[PDB]
Structures are given as C-alpha cells and as structure tokens.
Amino acid sequence: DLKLPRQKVELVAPPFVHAHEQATKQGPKIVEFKLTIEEKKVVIDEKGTTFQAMTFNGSMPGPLMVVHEGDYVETTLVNPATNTMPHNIDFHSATGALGGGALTLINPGEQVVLRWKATKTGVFVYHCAPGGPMIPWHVVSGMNGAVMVLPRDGLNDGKGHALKYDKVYYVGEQDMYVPRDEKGNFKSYDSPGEAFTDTEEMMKKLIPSHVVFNGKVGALTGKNALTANVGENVLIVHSQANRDSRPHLIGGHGDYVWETGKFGNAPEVGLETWFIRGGSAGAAMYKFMQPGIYAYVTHNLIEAADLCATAHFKVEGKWNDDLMTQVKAPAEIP
Amino acid sequence: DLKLPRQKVELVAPPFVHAHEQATKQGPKIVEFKLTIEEKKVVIDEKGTTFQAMTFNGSMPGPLMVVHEGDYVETTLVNPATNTMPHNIDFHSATGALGGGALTLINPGEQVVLRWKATKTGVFVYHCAPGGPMIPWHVVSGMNGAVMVLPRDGLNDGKGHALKYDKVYYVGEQDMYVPRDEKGNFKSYDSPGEAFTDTEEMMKKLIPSHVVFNGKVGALTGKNALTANVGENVLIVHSQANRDSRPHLIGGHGDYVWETGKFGNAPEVGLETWFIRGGSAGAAMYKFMQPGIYAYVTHNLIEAADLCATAHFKVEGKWNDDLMTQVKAPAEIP
Amino acid sequence: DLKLPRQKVELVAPPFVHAHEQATKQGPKIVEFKLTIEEKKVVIDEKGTTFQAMTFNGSMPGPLMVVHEGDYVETTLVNPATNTMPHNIDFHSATGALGGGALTLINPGEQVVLRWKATKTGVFVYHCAPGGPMIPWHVVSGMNGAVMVLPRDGLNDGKGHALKYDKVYYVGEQDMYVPRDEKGNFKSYDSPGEAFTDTEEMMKKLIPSHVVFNGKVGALTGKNALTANVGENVLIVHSQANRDSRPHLIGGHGDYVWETGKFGNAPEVGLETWFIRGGSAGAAMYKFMQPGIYAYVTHNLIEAADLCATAHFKVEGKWNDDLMTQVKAPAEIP
C-alpha cells in the first residue's frame, strides 16, 4: 500500500559511515537495511582479555544507518541458527511498540522485517531489548548502534547558515563488565549464557572493567587512527546506550555541538567537553586548524587512559604559529 | 500585613497531582499546604526487602505542590510525636534561609509555618536538610518531593505557541542504600536510628542497592501503570534529589523538554533521552501517537531493569501503520 | 615577529581571581603568566588525612587566568629541581599540540614558554597531561586549574543586555583517591611515586574517597567563607577536570548560568542546580537577595556533606520578609 521508491544501503563497519547525501532533492523513499546478529567471543584489550560479545553485523558498535526526515526505514533483522539467544531491535528514532522491540523478537533461525517512519531528526541509539534483565545484558554485551536522521536541507547553525561536513565518523562507546577470579585475573567463558551469572552480579555494582571505543582498547589508534586535514570540517557522532560519557577533542574543540543529538535544536558553539547521556547519541563538528595528533577521549581521564576510552586523529597540514607556538623550548631554569 | 486571598490545596499522593489551572486570570494568592512527616518501615521490592523510610505525607516522593509565579506558598510542616528525629524543609524554589531549612527545624511534637514567594518558574526539588551528615541520610531515606511554579499564562514553546498538557504525572526517583549482611542478604532494622551506621557506610561508597520510582520496584506497573490515549499531551515531571537520572520513554520521545526544569528557558525538542541532574527536577511533554505499552525508564538499563527504575504507560487508541508496521512477522530464514 | 604590547599578570590563589577588566577598550595584547609546579604532601581533612599533591603554583585548584578574546597568552611553566616527576600543561582554551601538552613537557630543573591565541570565549580547564596512565594520576593529584576568556564587550544575557559581575570567585572541585589499609585507615606515603601503585588501583574503581573545594574539607568555610552583600552580582566559576559535578547554591539560584561554560552561547536562566561535565568549567551568576549563610555544594549530598564538597557564603544586608518569612515559629502541635 506504501508506494514510494525503494533504495538499498550497503552498511559499512564503524567508525566509517555508508555513503549518503546531506542536503537532498530526493523526496521520501523506503530505505532498506539488513542487520545480521552475531554472538562471538572477542579480545577487548592488549593483554588478551576475552569477552562474550553480542553484536549487530559483527561490530561494536553496530553500523551507523543514515536517512532523511520523512524516509521510511525498512530493516531486515536476521538471527542465524548459529546464535543461542533470542534478540530484537529497539530504535529510539521510531514511534510505537517499544521502538520496534515488541515487533522484532526472533529466535535463532528466524528473521523479521520492520518499517518505521523517520519523523524526528538527529542521531539516535538503536539496541537489542529482549525483555527484563536481558535488556541491560544484551546492550552491555555490545548490541547497540545508532541511526542518523538528517533534515532534507542538511544541517544548519540555527542562525540560517548551512553546516556541511567533509566527513563523518561514528564513535560508539561501550561499557563492559568482565568479572575477575580470586587471584584478580579476568575470567573467560565458553558461551554468553555461561558468562551471564557472574556478569550480572558485576553489572549491578555499576562499575565497568573496560570502557572502549569501537569494541577494543586502542581500536581507533595506529593504523586505525581517524584522519583529517587542516581546513576539513569533521562530524563526530558519539553514542552510549547505557552510561554517560563526556567527549573531548584534546587540542581542539566542538565548534558546533548537539549534545542531546537532535537537529530540531540549534547547536551550541565553542565547547571544550560535551555530555552524552546514557541511552543517547550526540554529534559534534570541528574544523581542524592545526596538524598533528589529537586524542578524542571521554574526559573521565581514568576511563580514557586506564580503562580504554581513547581514539586518535592524525591530521595533515601546515602548522599555524599565530594560534600556538613554543616561544622557548625546554631549558634549564636560570 | 500581607493581605491577599488565601487558597487551601488538598495534596494528593504521587504520581497524581492536585487539581490546578495552567493559564490563570487569578492574581497572586497565598496558597496553603500542609505536610506531615512520617517515619516508617516499608517494603521496597518484590522479594520483601524492607527499608527505614522517612517521608513527607507518607509517600516517596512527597507530593507535588503546584502554584503560579508570584503566589505566596504557605506551608505548615508537622512533625508528630510518633517520629524519632528532628526534620525541616528546604525548597529549591525559595529565596533565603537555606531554602527555608534554617527556619523550619522541628522536633517530634512540633509544627512550623513558612511562607515564601514563588519568584522563579519551573519544577523544583524540596527536601529535608537538618544539618551535617543528616542531610544526605534524610534525603536518601525518602524525604524529598517537588514543587511546580507555572507562568500565569501557562507553558509555551519559546516561539510564541502555547503548550497545554492534558494531564501531568510526577515521577520521583529515589536512590536507596540498603546494607547486606555477610551471607549477602539485605539487612532489616528496627528504627531509622539503628539503620544509620550501616547505611552511612554504604552511602559513602556511592552505589545504590535500589533505584525506584514512587518508592518501590514496580510501583508504577500493573494496576498502577500510568495511562494515556492517543492524541493526549502528557507532562511528566521527574525529580531526583541526590543523584543523576536519564529519563527515556521507550517507544516515544520528549516532544518538548525542560531538562534543567526551568520555564524561563525554552524547551528543547524531539529528544530521545534527557538528563535530570541530581538535586533538580525536570519536565518533558509528549503527545502519544501509538497505543500499547510503553516503559518509562532511566536509561542506565542496569538501574532500570535490575535495580527498580521502570514505570509503564498503558495507552489506548488506534495503531498507526504509517508510523510503524511489521512488514513481515518472524519467520524461518530462507 | 608578534609585535603587540605585553602585560604581566600577578596570579592570586583561589578562590580569589587576579584583577581584570570585564569590558575593555584595550586591543589584543600578549598577557604573561608564570606557573611554578610544586609537589607536596598536604592535609585534606579535619581528621588529619594526608595526600601526595601535585600542583600549579602550590594550590588546588591552580589559579584562575583571565584574558580577553584575541589576546595571546604566554605562559612560563617552571618545574623546579626539587620535584621528582616530569610535568606539562594542556589548555582546553588553546588550539593544537594537545592543548600545549605536546610542547611543554619539562623535567625537574627545566622551564618552557608556550604562547596560544585566545580564539574561544568562556571558562576552560587547564591541566597536566604527561602521557599515558600518568595523565589521570597527575590530574587527580591536583594538577588542574582554569582560564577565563572574556568577550571584549564583557558578558551579555543573549538578549542584548550586559551582565556585569561585582565580584568573581573560582571554586575548583577535586576528586581524590586515598587508599585505605586493612584496618580501614587512610594510608600515608613518603612520595608521589610511592603512592602511585595503590592510588592507581583505587582510581580504576572510579569511587573517590574525598571530593573537596579549594583542596581540603572545609577550605571555603569559617574565616575563609566566601562573602557577598545583598544586591551584589557574584560570578562563580566552577571547574572539574576529571569527574562530573552538580553545583547548587542552597537558598539561592543561578540567575544566569553557562553550564558548558562557553560565552558564545546564551546563559540559561533561573536554575536550581547546574551540571559541570568532567573535563570542563562552567559559570553561574547570582544577585543576592537575602542576608545570612548560604552553602554552595555539589548536589550529590553524600559528596557534599560526607566527602567534603561544601563551601559557605556569608551575606550581609537586610532581610526581605516579602520573599520569605517564618509565619509561626516552632511550637507544640495543637
């Protein structure tokens, strides 16, 4: 009965984002996505600690889905028979049925197709929510991502000026709860089900063992650093499905920030650190002015440095001595 | 010397709110309220855990008081001789004398009458604050509520359009600290005084055992679910006197949200999750678009599902397939 | 090559702030500051608990630096040979080189000179950040302060009206992590290096032992209470370099609040409690209406009353019975 054009999207793994238009002259379409659930044991730190992850499309976070206001989003959710648990999906961008969760519960071996109309602009969390105590456990096991609903005219500054980004990255932050044994070493488990009792006991004490970006300590460093050039406007979408975060670009700023993540509200300007409320996504754009390495962190510095929550940007371009200069290098005190 | 009309209010137990006007053609009045302190042992979970509660009017939270800007609020606070401790009241809406706390300290068997002028619009916490270490203990024992100070012209969207709610609910969130014994069972105590030493030790570690709405796990579920109909605009006032919270309406949104709770500021629009800073109240309105059950949670999902912080709404009306539809029910993967 | 006038500033210890102009007819200058690092064992509570502090200029927080938009800030950082560790400085107000940290690493016995252009208005954190796990440890050991970058026309309310303060105070909040021994007493250490292993273990559990203003429990009480008079407009700058805080003036309000701390954004009005995201500074102004004592707290009341985070204001002037009055003093219940 809904006769609009259909468009398929090939999702890509974070921190990258599938190709999309900002401002568009397309009218509404039915945009088709597929997410395939994977339960899998993964390594989350450089010491080799393992974790029983549950994921959309094999990644933590799940991929970023991008559509425009008034599009219809049609998702095929697939739970292969190689998984052990039921799963579903709740989109914070959607209206009704617990965000879709009440219409998408699937056992191993099943799939389901949900459509929702994108009536609210901004970045939004999506996550699994099977019911009861399973809800937090599936989310902190990795089953969360985000969807960005853009205005058809693209982003603006709330003073009538367009804000166009040159590139967008999605940084999904994950609080993880890995129990320890008596000697103080992290425990390993053979299945998500086996990890459940010890993991839930730890979860209810509210202190994570690890806080990571893109699923692992150091994920967004080295070869996999984020990149930019001086003069480039970069949008950083940040989500946290369970716990607060306080993003900060060390050596930069948030030139335009939607910390509650919703484009019907004007961005704030010139921030040092912003705040992502647990259960939400937010977005910050910054035009790089200096080359070199930047760190992108949550500014609980214990979490950033000691628990895993640090990404790098490597930026190319020319140094600006007007903005900053070492007037005198380190020398002996007179 | 203050010669204005007097109006008595019959307070009602949360989550309901006493009858009031939004926009009014009344001028300032002296609005009279009575709060009677009750110390009492209560059950806070479905397992039968008990808690030494201290309350205004017998409820957690204390009742919502509603007045208009420029009203004078005259409260009779009563501490019956059946209580064991001194108590007082601090209104965050009031100016001077520690919010009234320095003028309202009463021993068991006494009462006091305070008047304050409502010069600041918004929703505000009130709580007991006797002095020193007693302040946190009385607050986390349940001695907090809220007061809503409306503009005389009612609420607006900051773009000149009136925002009228069809009904208002008050959700008071309480962090509770119940100690455990060596075997890991929650302790019970014979008096608030006896619970104090163990409770304070736990409090200073900053991790609650329970986080509840309306005083108990499941308080706002089942027979006592919140209700609405499709097309109804519902205002949800949320307070947290000690600890942050991140409200979220699962399957809905915050169409207009004052997360810092103050009506001199325009509301933000279209939020997924909002943030109530500990020591504050905030308010969100939403027009329901779909029938069915919704959950209202703090979106630390461990707190919501495992520690008690989940309410339900049951909504009547017609399902809108344009907004959301199950295109294909759960079926075997091809 | 940069030929502007130079101006030296004599920094003062918090909570006071060096003399400055709000609105100025000066053009850009090179403003010169000196910070000398001191590592020292200090007492942080009235019980005599000691702490291995690391400080800029001997204080926690480091002093407030005040400049205007478009000034160049030239800091001489000095690490005397009496210290044991390398140090540096990161200014959140600056652009490039990790905020200056990549250009200012100095061993004991060295100094360095950094210049940065103040292109972003607001209050901003500065802190040490030597690298890796040292970053959180130096910050929570006390190595943080703030810098305020004012518009050249002074502050405004976002509706075209000037906001001029009669005085400004800087309240730096510090989360501290002091380990305990088996009997439950706080440990003392002979050097920062010796405190490191036990302190880091505690830090990673994310629960502070103390949360203080101006470096010690009770620092801003008694002889050292903050002061004002009825009718005075007071700006309170609040910073927290690692952990969130929720400031509240008990018996007052935030008449104009920049909770994200950035003057390119209009202030919010009439707040009860505001939120300082860890890694940021914010600012609130209030015109005092009533005399007497006020407490300024973080409104986690456990932190405020039990962990150290309470300051007082003593305010002189005439009581306003229109705003608040004790209609009937404490008396026996009829």
Ligand SMILES: OC[C@H]1O[C@@](CO)(O[C@H]2O[C@H](CO)[C@@H](O)[C@H](O)[C@H]2O)[C@@H](O)[C@@H]1O
């Ligand atoms: O940035 C959103 C913010 O900007 C305003 C103008 O101040 O509206 C702009 O953005 C709207 C949403 O994209 C457009 O519909 C509108 O036409 C444009 O002026 C605000 O109303 C809004 O809060």
Ligand SMILES: OC[C@H]1O[C@@](CO)(O[C@H]2O[C@H](CO)[C@@H](O)[C@H](O)[C@H]2O)[C@@H](O)[C@@H]1O
């Ligand atoms: O919603 C409050 C917000 O709206 C504005 C107009 O943008 O003012 C409106 O609300 C005020 C407080 O109720 C009214 O006094 C005013 O007349 C009305 O325009 C903003 O100034 C305010 O921040």
Ligand SMILES: OC[C@H]1O[C@@](CO)(O[C@H]2O[C@H](CO)[C@@H](O)[C@H](O)[C@H]2O)[C@@H](O)[C@@H]1O
């Ligand atoms: O308070 C900042 C806020 O006010 C506005 C006007 O609404 O701009 C004012 O402040 C600017 C920064 O100081 C001035 O440049 C401007 O001239 C003045 O109108 C907003 O644009 C700004 O967000």
Ligand SMILES: O=N[O-]
């Ligand atoms: O050895 N397990 O606690």
Ligand SMILES: O=N[O-]
């Ligand atoms: O390196 N000494 O000046």
Ligand SMILES: O=N[O-]
């Ligand atoms: O048995 N009490 O710890």
Ligand SMILES: O=N[O-]
């Ligand atoms: O239920 N199987 O298609």
Ligand SMILES: O=N[O-]
């Ligand atoms: O005695 N030290 O744990």
Ligand SMILES: O=N[O-]
């Ligand atoms: O003090 N009794 O009224």
Ligand SMILES: [Cu+2]
């Ligand atoms: Cu799942």
Ligand SMILES: [Cu+2]
């Ligand atoms: Cu959710």
Ligand SMILES: [Cu+2]
């Ligand atoms: Cu009390």
Ligand SMILES: [Cu+2]
């Ligand atoms: Cu209070």
Ligand SMILES: [Cu+2]
């Ligand atoms: Cu240092």
Ligand SMILES: [Cu+2]
């Ligand atoms: Cu920093």
